[PDB]
Amino acid sequence: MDFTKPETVLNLQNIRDELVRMEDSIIFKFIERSHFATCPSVYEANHPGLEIPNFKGSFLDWALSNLEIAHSRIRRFESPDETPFFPDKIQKSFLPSINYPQILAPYAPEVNYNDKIKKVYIEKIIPLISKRDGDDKNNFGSVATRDIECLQSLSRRIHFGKFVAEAKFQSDIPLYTKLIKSKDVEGIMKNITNSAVEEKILERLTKKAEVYGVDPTERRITPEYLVKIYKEIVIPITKEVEVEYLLRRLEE
């Protein structure tokens, strides 16, 4: 899957294959985060004791914005598969730009569930991957840099819905246009949903959490929890993206 060969990107099989690769990445990251306590204070906005002057948001928010300018600089978000958490806040870098040929429809960057993803990650995901419960007072930074990678992976994967969506739209334009004009939510949804694929996903994840999750000579990840997570969050939201993208697919 090459980003300057529109064809090799708008290929569903490929797209799924890439998603499969991400499974491990995401796993590895969860595994990492498991080492530290929950660290409530890190996600709590404007925490006294962790106040950063002229800045409003949570320790994590800060950490995430800083990092985003760093990645911003090495041209990260200039890429269609990369969508920033603090979008209206990054600057055009000091580096020639890779001129990625248009694959997705122009408004594509506007679709941005990071607000949701960040939220659900903090509230639903954290309790399931973190070990102890409480504030690990001198690992806030640690915890933070980790939450960020999880978050970025999570976002890449999830925001992949746009490609899938586009790819599918291609496969049957009349059918989709109809549904879209119709603003037929349930109709589109059931058409894009393929329970068989998502069925295999949940199965393999269980196996991976079992091998990677234990010292091969312990238990940094809970198989059932990972399923819970992908089932209740990862897969659901990817589909939200898919439909939202689809509706606006006939704009001017």
Ligand X SMILES: O=C(O)[C@@H]1C[C@]2(C(=O)O)C=C[C@@H](O)[C@@H](C2)O1
Annotated binding-site ranges for L-tryptophan: 138-139, 141-142
Closest by CA to 162, choosing from 233, 86, 246, is 246
Per the DSSP assignment, residues forming a β-bridge with 58 are: 45
- The stretch near ligand X (CB under 6 A) out of 82-90, 105-113, 176-184, 232-240 is 232-240
**Residue ranges for the binding site?**
75-76, 138-139, 141-142, 145
What does 219 interact with, of its own copies, ligand X, ligand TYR, none (CB < 5 to 8 A by kind)? Answer: its own copies
Residue 215 Cβ, how far from ligand X at the closest point, in Å?
27
**Binding of residue 123 to its own copies (CB under 8 A):** yes
Residue 242 appears among annotated catalytic residues: yes
Size of the site for its own copies (CB under 8 A): 15
Q: Which residue has the tokens 């890439």?
A: 18
Task: Calculate the CA 109 to chain-centre distance.
Answer: 14
Q: Strand, helix or coil at 117? A: helix
At residue 224, φ and ψ (nearest 5 deg) are: -60, -40
Determine contact, residues 90/64, Cβ cutoff 8 Å: no
Closest by CA to 52, choosing from 65, 33, 40, is 65
Residue 21 appears among annotated catalytic residues: no
Q: With respect to its own copies, which residue has the nearer C-beta, 126 or 150?
A: 126
Q: With respect to ligand X, which residue has the nearer C-beta, 81 or 242?
A: 242
Residue 132 appears among annotated catalytic residues: no
Q: Which of 16, 35, 47, 75 binds ligand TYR (CB under 6 A)?
A: 75
Looking at 29, 118, 157, 162, which residue is catalytic?
157
DSSP 58: B
Angle, CA of 129, 242 and 12, to the nearest 5°:
95
- The stretch near ligand X (CB under 6 A) out of 74-82, 98-106, 129-137, 196-204 is 196-204
Catalytic positions, please? 16, 157, 168, 194, 198, 238, 242
